[PDB]
From a paper:
The hydroxyl group of both enantiomers point in the same direction toward Y126 and Y140. S-TBZ binds with its phenylethyl substituent anchored deep in the hydrophobic pocket. The smaller tertiary butyl group of S-TBZ is positioned towards the substrate entry channel. The central quaternary carbons of the enantiomers are approximately 1 Å apart, with R-TBZ projecting deeper into the active site cavity which easily accommodates the smaller tert-butyl substituent. The key water 743 identified in the wild type FLC structure is not seen in either TBZ structure. S-TBZ was found to be the more active enantiomer with 15-fold lower MIC50 than R-TBZ. We observed 8.7 fold (0.64 ± 0.11 μM) and 11.9 fold (0.87 ± 0.06 μM) reduction in susceptibility to S-TBZ in the Y140F and Y140H mutant strains respectively.
Author numbering: 8 to 532
Write the structure that this text describes.
């Protein structure tokens, strides 16, 4: 019976001929049926880690992952252990939880994975081109060296009074404070902290000129650039809407202002050591001998400040929120402040910051309970074997590492969900290499990445801003502590994190009430 083949033919014709009702209905029910079958087949393969089950094709587990990612990882971990996959808006994520997860993704060979491949679609439109994830990795490595060159301890001794000047200036003039006119008030930390962060960062990393442009309408351009830095730009990076354009406008606009200042500096020889602009001018020639274009330098500046803006500001928000219900921790930090700065007589210096271990433990502890990035990604370039398993992660897959999840595990942190800065007694450093090191182009960093506290990651893509963040957060918190007490409004406590955004920032409005420690103190100027 090719008479049966006559009928696949006939049947095919009747399919194309039935009402639109059933056809759309079939255009739905066929993919739904197919993927459900496909998964059951997949669950038989054992060169593949267990795939989380999902009903909606393409979308996969994006809803629950997007909303409560650590909760997703946990029930996932109970069911399948530390390695498992799940489908996310078209892509396939293989999650490896714990320190071996860190090792498998952060220390992965350059050939196995790509961060550029994972991130460029989201970062390049915001930062500019020619830099970060819009160049070969080797270039990235040299840029990180260029930037890290302006992040030296002597830069930090110069940044500390600039940053303090800013915080004080903010207490003086900001509508949310007015310390020379108010002794008490309410602020939204989600409003205060991003302004405080951009002011301090701008002033210290981009110099006084660029800090000054933030008082004008120009500031709004940073705010535009800011909203194009969203996970939506990670799925649909370019659809003709409209926040997508103001972003691009802002990119050239902001990048324009930097080149303007850069070109005028080389043209007057105004190239001192003031900021990162001076520094990137004096030092941005690759080792093959190519030099960064003035455009490229500017774009590297947008990227630095943008990255540093969101992590830092979220973190100082959390510090305020956790402290707001711990007058005991405030009392303790204040005593240290009095001891190290001789009641206040001594002026804050980068050196003196290092003698404030409790202040540094608070940043350490907050960064433990609140990692700004719940998920780091790579695209898999070559089929990877997972040690001590038969598992193969084929190329074209994505790997996902999550040190912020381990941070919150009792196993590695007794009472992980309690805020306790004393868990870091005689252990206050931003991080430290528990042994041997390795150098990827931007200096010797730890070779192992099996530390269960890994706030800044590791491997070639490891953060180079930890000492800047601590410096800024250090000055900022030091001053808050000496100037203010603060607490929650009645019946208000720590907000749950909003995971859907770029950084795990708190769910606003997150309000605290400040009062002056010295009502009659006046900030001068
Ligand atoms: C609390 C503050 C911060 C935290 C928790 C943090 C966290 C991280 C993490 C986890 C990574 C690795 C990402 C990955 O491997 O996929 C990273 C990378 C990086 N961070 Fe930070 N960061 C912070 C502040 C900063 C600051 C202030 C700067 C700039 C001054 C900065 C610049 C960078 C750069 C340039 C990379 C390199 C990424 C790469 O090479 O692929 N970060 N950061
Ligand atoms: C890729 C992404 C998650 C946005 C990112 O890791 C990387 C951002 C980033 C990358 C390169 C430069 Cl030169 C500056 C900032 C977030 N982040 C981490 N530390 C600071 N920002």
């Amino acid at each position: 019976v090719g008479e049966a083949l006559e009928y696949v033919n006939i049947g095919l014709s009747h399919f194309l001929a039935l009402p639109l009702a059933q056809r759309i209905s079939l255009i739905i029910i066929i993919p739904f049926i197919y993927n459900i079958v496909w998964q059951l087949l997949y669950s038989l393969r054992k060169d593949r880690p267990p795939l989380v089950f999902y009903w909606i094709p393409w979308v996969g587990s994006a809803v629950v992952y997007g909303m409560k990612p650590y909760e997703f990882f946990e029930e996932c971990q109970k069911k399948y252990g530390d390695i498992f996959s799940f489908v996310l808006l078209g892509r396939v994520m293989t999650v490896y939880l714990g320190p071996k997860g860190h090792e498998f993704v952060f220390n992965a060979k350059l050939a196995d994975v790509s961060a550029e491949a994972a991130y460029a679609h989201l970062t390049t439109p915001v930062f500019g081109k020619g830099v970060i994830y819009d160049c070969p990795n080797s270039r990235l490595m040299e840029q990180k060296k260029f930037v890290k060159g302006a992040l030296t301890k002597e830069a930090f001794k110069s940044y500390v009074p600039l940053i303090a000047e800013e915080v004080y200036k903010y207490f003086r003039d900001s509508k949310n404070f007015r310390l020379n006119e108010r002794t008490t008030g309410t602020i939204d930390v989600m409003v205060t902290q991003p302004e405080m962060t951009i002011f301090t960062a701008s002033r210290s990393l981009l110099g006084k000129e660029m800090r000054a442009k933030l008082d004008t309408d120009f500031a709004y351009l940073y705010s535009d650039l800011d909203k194009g830095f969203t996970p939506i730009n990670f799925v649909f990076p370019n659809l003709p809407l409209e926040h997508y354009r103001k972003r691009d406008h802002a990119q050239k606009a902001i990048s324009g202002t930097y080149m303007s200042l850069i070109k005028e500096r080389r043209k007057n020889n105004d190239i001192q050591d003031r900021d990162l602009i001076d520094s990137l001018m004096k030092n941005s020639t690759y080792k093959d001998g190519v030099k960064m274009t003035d455009q490229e330098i500017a774009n590297l500046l947008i990227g630095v400040l943008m990255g540093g803006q969101h992590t830092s500001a979220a973190t100082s928000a959390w510090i305020l929120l956790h402290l707001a219900e711990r007058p005991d921790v405030q009392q303790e930090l204040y005593e240290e402040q009095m001891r190290v700065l001789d009641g206040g007589k001594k002026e804050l210096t980068y050196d003196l910051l290092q003698e404030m271990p409790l202040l540094n433990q608070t940043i350490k502890e907050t960064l433990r309970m609140h990692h700004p990035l719940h998920s780091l990604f790579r695209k898999v370039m070559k089929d990877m074997h997972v040690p001590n398993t038969s598992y193969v992660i084929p190329a074209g897959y994505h790997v996902l590492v999550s040190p912020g999840y381990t941070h919150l595990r009792d196993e590695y942190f007794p009472n992980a969900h309690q805020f306790n800065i004393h868990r870091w007694n005689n252990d206050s450093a931003s991080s430290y290499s528990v042994g041997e090191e390795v150098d990827y182009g931007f200096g010797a960093i730890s070779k192992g990445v099996s530390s269960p506290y890994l706030p800044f990651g590791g491997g070639r893509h490891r953060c180079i801003g930890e000492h800047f963040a601590y410096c800024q957060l250090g000055v900022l918190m030091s001053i808050f502590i000496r100037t203010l007490k603060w607490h929650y409004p009645e019946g208000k406590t720590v907000p749950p994190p909003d995971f859907t955004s770029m950084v795990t920032l708190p769910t606003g409005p997150a309000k605290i009430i400040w009062e002056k420690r010295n009502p009659e103190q006046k900030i001068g100027g």
